[model samples]
Target: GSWELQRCREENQELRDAIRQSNQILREVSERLLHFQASQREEKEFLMAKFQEARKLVEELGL
Candidate 1:
């Protein structure tokens, strides 16, 4: 029946909107993940150098 077709069409439109929204959310998440990783990389390098300095100081204590 035409009624069934109309219902199906409405359902399909809702599904299309939901799919598009999901895609946008995923894109945002990917972008944020890359930014977060880059920040962490720089932070890790700074922390590593500080740690090395601490080790050298401890070694020099010689106690």
Candidate 2:
């Protein structure tokens, strides 16, 4: 009975290690996600400016 309890103790340490490793992986992925989102935001702002300029040109040319 006590032997199985000792086995559980080892397994408990492994679980803790897994938790630490997963936390590290999550932080790395979260950093990359933020970087990607910032770049996407910059591109969107640039496109909106271009679109407005295009609309101005269209109105000046005909409407």
Candidate 3:
């Protein structure tokens, strides 16, 4: 019975280690997603500003 208990404890420790590693990977991926979303927002704003400037220039030329 004692040997069996020792084996069970070892298996439990291995499972816990695996869960910790998975959680760390998930955290890293979440941070990367946030960074990507922020970059996309900045790029969209830049394009909108350029479009507005072009429209104004066209109006000034009376086209």
Candidate 4:
């Protein structure tokens, strides 16, 4: 019975290591996601400005 307790502790430690590794992976992926989102935000602003300017021109041209 005491030997089973020892086994449980070892398994628990292994689980803790696994959890740490997963957390590290998640952090890296989240960092990349933020970078991607920032670039996308910048592009969207540029596109919106261009679109509005073009729409104004079309209206002036009688569209």
Local accuracy of candidate 2 as per-residue lDDT tens digits, 9-61: 99999999999999999999999999999999999999999999999999998
Q: Which numbered prediction scores highest in TM-score against the true structure?
A: 3
State the RMSD for candidate 2. Answer: 2.5
Q: Tens digit of lDDT per residue, candidate 3, span 1-63?
A: 699999999999999999999999999999999999999999999999999999999999985
Top candidate when judged by lDDT against the true structure: 1
Which residue segments of model 2 deviate by more than 4 Å? none
Model 4's alpha-carbon lDDT is 0.97
**Deviation from native of the Cα of residue 19 in model 3, angstroms:** 0.9
lDDT tens digits, residue span 1-63, model 1? 699999999999999999999999999999999999999999999999999999999999998
| lDDT agreement of model 2 with the native | 0.97
Question: How does model 4 score by TM-score?
Answer: 0.60
Clash tally, candidates in order: 0, 0, 0, 0
Rank candidates, TM-score, best first.
Answer: 3, 1, 2, 4
Residue 14, candidate 3: alpha-carbon lDDT: 96
Judge candidate 3 against the unseen true structure and give its global Cα lDDT, from 0 to 1: 0.97
- Per-candidate Cα RMSD to the true structure, in Å, reads 2.5, 2.5, 1.9, 3.1
| lDDT score for residue 6 of model 2 | 91
Candidate 4 lDDT, 6-48, residue by residue in tens: 9999999999999999999999999999999999999999999
User: Where in model 3 is the C-alpha error above 4 Å?
Assistant: 1-7
Off by over 4 Å in 4: 59-63
TM-score result, candidate 2: 0.70
